Structure 1
Amino acid sequence: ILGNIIESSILSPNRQLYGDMHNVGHVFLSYTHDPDHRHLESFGVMGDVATAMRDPVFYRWHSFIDDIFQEHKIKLPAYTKSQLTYEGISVTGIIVQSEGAPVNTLHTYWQQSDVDLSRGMDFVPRGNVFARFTHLQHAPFQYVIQIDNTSDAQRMGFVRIFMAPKNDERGQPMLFRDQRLFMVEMDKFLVALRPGANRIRRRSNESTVTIPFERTFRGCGWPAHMLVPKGLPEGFPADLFVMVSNYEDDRVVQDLVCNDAASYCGVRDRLYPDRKAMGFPFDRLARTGVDRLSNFVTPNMAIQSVNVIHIDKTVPRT
């Protein structure tokens, strides 16, 4: 409700009262040079969806907005130990494997990609016109996850993978009150867990967070080449978290067009396939006596140190 009020979509219950806060702020921030249109100038980049993310103030404005949503979030009861454990299910391990690199290591670098700008060059002579763009990229990788079942029965579970920095700005281990807001969603997908031990392999280019590299460079999703943060040349430390939640509670009543098909497209699908709050389990304050991710974790969760390495070099795309 709050998101519709703040954006001010049509669905806002009272647009007279709560206004059109997000859109109008954008417009305000884009018009400081000509607020009464006496200089006949258009809006800055913040006034355009296409271009707004270019401006540093985009993050400042949206952080201001986030504080409002956070103000709602902290009112909700912490998730209980009951609410987090999946009884019988226990995750013992998660590792990341890349090609040619040590275990628990992600790799980023720069890449050059060509794109045909010919369909967009009005009144220029026809023919291929290639623009070469430089952009971040990571080396492909796979998660390996070990889950021990313990039921005699098959169990269905949502695998929810996030990643965050280990340390704050000052190189000090982060605490849950801060870390939870720094958790970046990396993947969410359904699995079937046989009784006893299960070994799940999940490639990076399967992430439900992303969309193929083909769709950026010649069904909404984050661009595949920005899955992994830059990291550092000396190595940047992160915490990788995974939770296996109970799908029998997370299941959504709707049945539409193998449950394991998790590619969600807002136009295609009438309802969002996970009853949990988006961002679960990090969207609330910790239950009493949890101070850090180490104390938060239930058995169906697991944590791994991961080193994110940046190499300042450029590859032609393979």
Structure 2
Amino acid sequence: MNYKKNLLLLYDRPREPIFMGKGKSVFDVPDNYLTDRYRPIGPEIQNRFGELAEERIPVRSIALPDLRIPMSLGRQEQFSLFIPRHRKIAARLIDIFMGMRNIEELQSCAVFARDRINPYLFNYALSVALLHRRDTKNLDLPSVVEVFPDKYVDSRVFEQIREEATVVPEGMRMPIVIPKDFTASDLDEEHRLWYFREDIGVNLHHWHWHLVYPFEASNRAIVDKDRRGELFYYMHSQLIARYNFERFCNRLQRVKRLNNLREPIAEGYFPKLDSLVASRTWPGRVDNAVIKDLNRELDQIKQDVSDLERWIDRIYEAVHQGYVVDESGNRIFLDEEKGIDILGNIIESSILSPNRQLYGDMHNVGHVFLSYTHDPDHRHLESFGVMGDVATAMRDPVFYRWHSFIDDIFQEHKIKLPAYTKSQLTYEGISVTGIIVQSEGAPVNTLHTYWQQSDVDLSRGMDFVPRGNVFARFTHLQHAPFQYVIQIDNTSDAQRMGFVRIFMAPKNDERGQPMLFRDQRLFMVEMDKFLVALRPGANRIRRRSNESTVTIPFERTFGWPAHMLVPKGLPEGFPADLFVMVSNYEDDRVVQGVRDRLYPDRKAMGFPFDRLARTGVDRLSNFVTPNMAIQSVNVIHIDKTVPRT
């Protein structure tokens, strides 16, 4: 019905009151729905904004549960899911929206609440409700860039957009270029990774992943998605693999973990963002900032660094011991199957953790500590830095250090698992004899990258700005389209089903030597995984880059961003090993890419390379079984700006 489309109007201009009229419509709000500020002049308003609209949406006056808790968070305050208190507020609001029987009462509850609670919080609470309420399925939620551009764009543009929109008539408006590589100069070598850390695409992917797999909400089934623990491990683990790749393409070494929390943090980061909702800017972190004990009475944070250290010490112990202990006192064993999944829930701290009280909230609390170095006891009445919000956390370099550490902890369980036997990763009969890649107008086994401007309408997000279009020009990494061509022999006499698993790693190390397996296995980034039917004899499989199951199409973002599928490489060319494996789909099958049910692969995530090598294996070229293939690829960057065409 219309109702579904009418809720989407709530996302329009989040700070403009709901009675101001969104798109080609306007809401006919009761007077008891007006805020205390505006209610005493309600007559002057409803009339003043009503016209020039094709529709007037009526809204029925309902009972409405107490909205005290939802309204506890200030309107001009920041909202983060990492802060203990906010979690309880959001989870309560989510509960209200979720608890509205009809799609009409959801519209009524929403319309009332919208102008009383924190915009950032509202957006989250609604987003979560719509996606998991049963009436509002298969919907198109507007990109959070378009509703909250302040979390994605240098604050400098805002006063240009205001100028352009006020001075120049519609149709003659110039697109606003969004600054790139703007957070640090060349004195900071970290500035080179702007195209990854600060890319709109990857920041959206991270935000959205945490939307669909929350770690604590209310009602366990929403949190309890198949293998979400392992997902949390793997997804974040791939972020760093990809980051470490991009590091090598900018003449840097692999990211160093946060060894220990007492030592200073070398790399500072000023994000250059200005929250229009908080009307303040996000604080920066200086070079050689030190983590400090938190005492944020308001936010309900009373945590010492030693608490964090204690959690880590215990988690390590469990991992080495090989088992954990639940609240009850019983032991649960970190086996080959569910071990990783358990560990994930323990480490991030999802309510699925078998003993939150003992093993703590290790990952999340780390995000808060790192974001509050500048004001840990709230004496300066300052908010958290960028690492305190999932939406912005990936912008900071320290993210990769903290997430690097966390990964090492997971590793110190994976290295305990028994090596995959020759048997276990052989497909009797199947043999892959070669894989290549081809781009139009480029040699074989060669990938190209470059810069590319794209346009986004940030009009819905620009509150109290003259209506019209406001196009912004993003510059971001892009790769030329390509396709894999895989030669597979059956030699069985029957149709064989198989999973094609494609990863890519660097060929050598930072010192220029052909990488060993122990090293290289951790640098393999997944590129594709798809099901294929093989006829007896010979099969030529072809797969386009845009068919990738790791990626989501550009149009959707505006899943990992498509333009970020290929590492940057170097102008002189960057050498890389492309790897493919065909596994026996009958074993890997899940009787029942992203998936809203169960995860469609029985094998562990990162399956060929998650575990250590079997004895005698030393490098990739002798790890291989017949049903695998390696290929030298060369990744060439070109510093030029292509259009979108």
Q: Which entry has the higher C-alpha Rg, 1 or 2?
A: 2
Q: CA deviation at 1:62?
A: 0.4
Q: CA deviation at 1:10?
A: 1.0
1:246 aligns with 2:584: yes
Cα deviations across residues 21-78 of structure 1 (Å, max 9, x unaligned)?
0000000000000001111111000000000000000000001000100000000000
- Partners of 2:475 and 2:464 in 1: how far apart? 27
Cα deviations across residues 148-205 of structure 1 (Å, max 9, x unaligned)?
0011110100000000000100111100000000000000000000111000110000
- Secondary structure of the residue that 2:522 maps to in structure 1? helix
1:307 aligns with 2:645: no
Q: Which has the higher helix share?
A: 2
Cα deviations across residues 289-315 of structure 1 (Å, max 9, x unaligned)?
000000100000000000000000001
Change in Cα spacing, 1:268 to 1:71, as seen in structure 2 (3 Å) is: closer
User: Superposed, which structure 2 residues align to 1:152-301 within 5 Å?
Assistant: 152-217=493-558, 221-254=559-592, 269-301=596-628
Change in Cα spacing, 1:65 to 1:37, as seen in structure 2 (3 Å) is: same
- Secondary structure of the residue that 2:382 maps to in structure 1? coil
Cα deviations across residues 187-239 of structure 1 (Å, max 9, x unaligned)?
0000000111000110000000000011122xxx1000000000000100000
- Partners of 1:23 and 1:247 in 2: how far apart? 37
- Secondary structure of the residue that 1:317 maps to in structure 2? coil
Q: CA deviation at 1:268?
A: 5.3
- Partners of 1:111 and 1:10 in 2: how far apart? 42
Between Structure 1 and Structure 2, how many residues are aligned? Answer: 304
Change in Cα spacing, 1:50 to 1:70, as seen in structure 2 (3 Å) is: same
Q: CA deviation at 1:270?
A: 1.9
User: How high is the TM-score relative to the length of structure 2?
Assistant: 0.47
* RMSD, matched Cα: 0.9
Q: CA deviation at 1:269?
A: 2.8
One of 56, 64, 69 as aligned partner of 2:405: 64
- Partners of 1:206 and 1:252 in 2: how far apart? 21
Cα deviations across residues 246-298 of structure 1 (Å, max 9, x unaligned)?
001101132xxxxxxxxxxx985321110000001100000000000001000
- Secondary structure of the residue that 2:402 maps to in structure 1? helix
Change in Cα spacing, 1:267 to 1:134, as seen in structure 2 (3 Å) is: closer
- Partners of 2:467 and 2:640 in 1: how far apart? 34
* Structure 1 unaligned blocks of 5 or more: 255-265
The runs of at least 4 consecutive aligned structure 1 residues that moved more than 6 Å come to none
- Partners of 1:267 and 1:195 in 2: how far apart? 31
- Partners of 2:571 and 2:545 in 1: how far apart? 21
- Secondary structure of the residue that 1:68 maps to in structure 2? helix
- Partners of 1:116 and 1:172 in 2: how far apart? 47
Q: CA deviation at 1:317?
A: 0.8
- Partners of 2:454 and 2:425 in 1: how far apart? 43
User: How high is the TM-score relative to the length of structure 1?
Assistant: 0.94
Change in Cα spacing, 1:166 to 1:267, as seen in structure 2 (3 Å) is: closer
- Partners of 1:107 and 1:290 in 2: how far apart? 32
- Partners of 1:270 and 1:317 in 2: how far apart? 35
Q: Which has the higher contact order (CA 8 A, sep 6+)?
A: 1
One of 90, 97, 101 as aligned partner of 2:431: 90
- Partners of 1:222 and 1:104 in 2: how far apart? 23
Q: Which has the higher strand share?
A: 1
- Partners of 2:582 and 2:426 in 1: how far apart? 9
